[PDB]
Amino acid sequence: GIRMATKIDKEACRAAYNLVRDDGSAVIWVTFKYDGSTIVPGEQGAEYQHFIQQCTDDVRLFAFVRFTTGDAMSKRSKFALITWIGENVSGLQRAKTGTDKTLVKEVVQNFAKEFVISDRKELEEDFIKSELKKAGGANYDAQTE
User: Where in the sequence is the domain holding 63, given as residue range(s)?
Assistant: First the structure.
């Protein structure tokens, strides 16, 4: 039947993870694809304009992106596990995604939070910055200097 005996290609996914993890890697975004019963590496890049193009219709995709946030007297950086699920994909597939987030999360343990997107307007990095600030944390105080 269908038993919970799924996997991840930790070494192939670690390869792209290792790059995106570095603040000096020109590659800032990677995608994680699926095969047989495992998560696998996908495309990679440095510019998010091409990310927009790559979001397809019914296929469910995941991404790992290095994202700079956290405001202090020193830089901070994060990673955002993104899940693409269009409105066309039936819930039976979303059920896999719902029990597969744990799998890719075992690779992507080096992260800050995850995000879920289904529309191009929802995919745009501009409001995602402030959304990641809200979901991140904030402060507004400036004295004792």
Answer: 1-145
* Cα gap 139→141, rounded to integer Å: 6
CATH number, domain with residue 141: 3.40.20.10
Please give the method by which this entry was determined. NMR
Chain centroid to CA 131: 14
**SS3 label, residue 66:** strand
Radius of gyration of the chain (CA): 16
The 10 Å Cβ neighbour count of residue 78 is 16
How far apart are alpha carbons 65 and 47 in whole angstroms?
11
DSSP for residue 36: T
Question: Are the CB atoms for 45 and 29 separated by under 8 Å?
Answer: yes
What is d(CA 42, CA 33) in angstroms, rounded to the nearest whole number?
5
